[PDB]
């Protein structure tokens, strides 16, 4: 019941939009070492996504301001921009390493079901990609290596265990395609994997469950929308 | 260039 | 430069949407005796509005979840919700008592221009009104009286100093009307006031400047949207 | 019931 109490506190935190309290309540549930239910897996992800998201949204904004004041030549200000970015960067490093560790320690070893195994190996890839975004050089290269072997491990399981209509598999494809395009700067690969996951889905769209319908269609929409932008630039 | 990634799954 | 360096850190924090860091940066500039410029005044308001705004949204949502779980009769949950609500109420108290303190101690005295005086007295009413929202019994009535004398003081100054078209005066009239409606349960006054402040603006629409045009017309449109909503089911 | 109030200047 102490576990159910924590899940409830996370839900109150979600609707209250206090996502710091959400990760904490859901962190204690991960450490419980029991395999998370589909509701708990979602809550944990929604929590750590919003908290890491907020910091990134800031990083990109101040990053653009750094490029603006780079041309202006206001050296006095450029120092403050960098100090503010390095402050936000350390936070991105902490939150990413927080969830990467509890994945490696509690969740990934515990997860036995094909669906759960994929969901986490994907999650690992995402937070290694988020480290790669701001990372510089041999720091970035290590984060990219980690990211790929995670997505690859997720993909190798997803191929046999999950069908192509499954939200988790499509979501993985999208993030792994976004990974290829942004991190590895290989658009030809990003477009293949995206077009592959998409065409595999529409082939068997008649099998898609009403439960998973809204989740997967949105993900498919976000695939074909990214495919349009990537192909029009080529 | 920022490109949309996997969103937050709907409740149930 | 110490103050100019802080204003910039606040501006970076504004765009980054890190409003916790924005209040701090602009809190130090306010602590300095020197009166805040219109830009600095705005950056402070923006910073402290967003930090409280977030909690106020949280308070209203959990307060409505409580209301729902009252009918369900989940006593185990109601204790968890009440405790979470209280945690937020204490936060709203601390952040309110911050801005009110730095208003009374530093800004209100320092404020010498007519425009500044109204804005800081308006600001005081706003943050005694936000106290009065989640406040109960004697505490609420005391927060209301504190808000009224603040709004009344601001209004007495705004009538003579500023013109009716000015965004600061229209903003006061709008916040004072919301006060009479939500806090004092005096809706017939709320509407009477909101309309009065509207009529006085449109009468002198020629006087309005192209600079302060957008700021005023937006607040004028809100006053009307409220007036419509309060006078139709 | 919550109603629009004076927003922070642009
Ligand atoms: Br009322
Ligand atoms: Na409304």
Numbering used by the authors:
A (entry chain B): 2 to 235
B (entry chain C): 95 to 106
C (entry chain A): 2 to 234
D (entry chain P): 95 to 104
Source paper text:
14-3-3 family proteins are important regulatory molecules involved in a staggering number of cellular processes that interact with target proteins in a phosphorylation-dependent manner. The GATAD1 S102P mutation we investigated in the screen was described to cause dilated cardiomyopathy (DCM) in an autosomal recessive manner in a consanguineous family. Building upon existing data for the role of 14-3-3 proteins in nucleocytoplasmic transport, we propose that the binding of 14-3-3 to GATAD1 masks the NLS and impairs the protein’s nuclear localization.
We found that GATAD1 pS102 interacted with 14-3-3ε with a binding constant of about 3 µM. Each monomer consists of nine α-helices and harbors one phosphorylated GATAD1 peptide in a binding groove formed by helices α3, α5, α7, and α9. 14-3-3ε binds the central phospho-serine 102 of the GATAD1 peptide via the triad Arg57, Arg130, and Tyr131, which is highly conserved in the 14-3-3 family. GATAD1 Pro104 packs into a hydrophobic cage formed by 14-3-3ε Leu219, Ile220, and Leu223, whereas Tyr100 of the peptide shows a T-shaped π stacking against Tyr182 and Trp231 of 14-3-3ε. Our structure explains the deficits of the non-phosphorylated GATAD1 peptide and the pathogenic S102P and the phosphomimetic S102D peptide variants to interact with 14-3-3ε. The non-phosphorylated serine, as well as the proline chain (in the S102P variant) and the aspartic acid side chains (in the S102D peptide variant), are too short to reach into the positively charged triad patch in 14-3-3ε for proper binding (bottom). A glutamic acid side chain in the S102E mutant, on the other hand, appears to be able to reach into the binding triad; however, it is not able to form a hydrogen bond with Tyr131 nor Lys50 of 14-3-3ε (bottom right).
